[PDB]
């Protein structure tokens with residue numbers, strides 16, 4: 001048995017992985033904001049209360065359905081910096097340099113989040129950035145109590161943080177002591193940055209003093225992001241990838257995500273079976289799904305990348321005839337081992 | 349990564365997945381600015397056939413080039429019924445995102461689970477390499493495991509997958525009803 005769903009019959013729902021951020025989004029709806037207004041408030045709130053994942057130093061995607069029936073996808077994914085190169089993470093022998101793509105300043109793409117938040121607010125929002133970012137600023141300035149789970153994830157990242165003088169300032173208490181469950185976590189410099197954004201918009205992140213701090217710290221610590229990278233960061237409004245499953249329309253993220261394409265591909269394969277007949281958790285149903293997944297991930301490894309740079313056969317991958325061909329290879333009693341799988345089934 | 353979902357009274361819906369990649373990103377902050385940098389460069393193929401943090405591989409299509417955006421698995425999704433919002437769904441989990449989101453959607457459409465049931469339901473995963481059927485603890489009983497093993501799956505129990513925040517919207521006489529679910533896996 002499962003707990004009952006959350007229910008609203010008035011203004012809708014705004015749901016995130018942190019109750020403080022969800023509450024902020026929900027209050028925006030209660031105060032007459034639309035789904036975009038709430039989404040923007042949440043994006044900034046999570047940057048403060050969920051720093052493991054929520055951010056202004058990263059990027060992402062927003063898939064949006066508008067009241068007028070339009071469906072759009074916002075790409076605020078990070079970009080490789082201007083000085084990036086194909087083999088930048090390899091040594092002279094052509095071998096991967098341990099941790100270079102994972103820990104530190106060279107591992108970073110040009111952040112898109114702040115640009116993404118502003119882009120959706122400007123095009124589709126109704127409230128002012130100041131109203132929507134103030135709750136995040138309040139939490140950065142005044143702090144919030146570290147949860148049990150946050151104490152745990154902080155501990156798991158501890159040795160990584162200790163590699164960087166910057167992170168030693170922000171993720172440890174006085175005397176470089178570990179933050180513990182129930183400690184007040186205050187983020188004064190983050191509040192300064194958020195205030196620049198409040199006052200100047202996205203230019204408060206991508207230009208001026210904050211852009212100067214980014215370039216400076218990059219130069220100091222072996223990174224390559226510059227003021228030129230930041231001033232040239234662009235969101236892209238893209239067409240979503242669209243499919244159908246049993247009379248429902250699926251709207252999901254297009255390149256530079258692979259997610260929407262393979263989601264629709266796998267559903268397409270599954271659509272050839274009456275899954276409802278045997279129900280949740282039936283081995284026959286799991287088998288059909290798993291074999292579709294197997295092919296999809298093989299296809300991912302060859303065909304998928306940023307379509308602004310490479311040719312991505314999205315239309316072929318989401319074609320129901322291709323899915324039918326995949327389905328017809330699925331045997332009732334056996335799998336196709338991954339060693340035998342060919343991307344596109346060798347016929348794309 | 350983290351996913352959030354919003355639906356308003358007018359029929360707008362916004363599904364946002366965003367991230368600094370790993371937990372705490374690159375672990376390096378911008379001194380003076382108070383934020384962590386992403387390690388999103390690891391979502392490129394940094395060498396042909398080299399597995400990344402999620403065991404994903406690539407070649408030319410996802411190679412690094414200046415200004416290029418690294419390939420993602422993020423799947424923020426909206427499902428429509430008669431061009432009206434029915435589901436708003438997404439999840440973190442790197443390579444596991446695609447399969448997590450698929451399962452939630454199928455659980456509603458195929459099996460008529462409510463959105464809480466659809467989210468809490470145990471999840472499986474196949475990503476071709478490694479060639480394994482990944483499951484969650486208590487998620488698959490002996491009879492099902494045995495039948496799938498007999499087919500040739502190598503079944504492995506691993507930590508819980510995903511953190512779905514999802515909304516289902518249904519019509520009523522006056523306006524709509526909104527049903528939501530967070531994911532019990534959030535704190536694991």
Ligand SMILES: N[C@H](C(=O)O)[C@@H]1CC=NO1
Pocket residue numbers: 349350367368369370388391419420421422439440441442443445
């Ligand atoms: N970096 C990954 C991707 O973009 O596919 C994120 C991290 C959390 N979910 O997926």
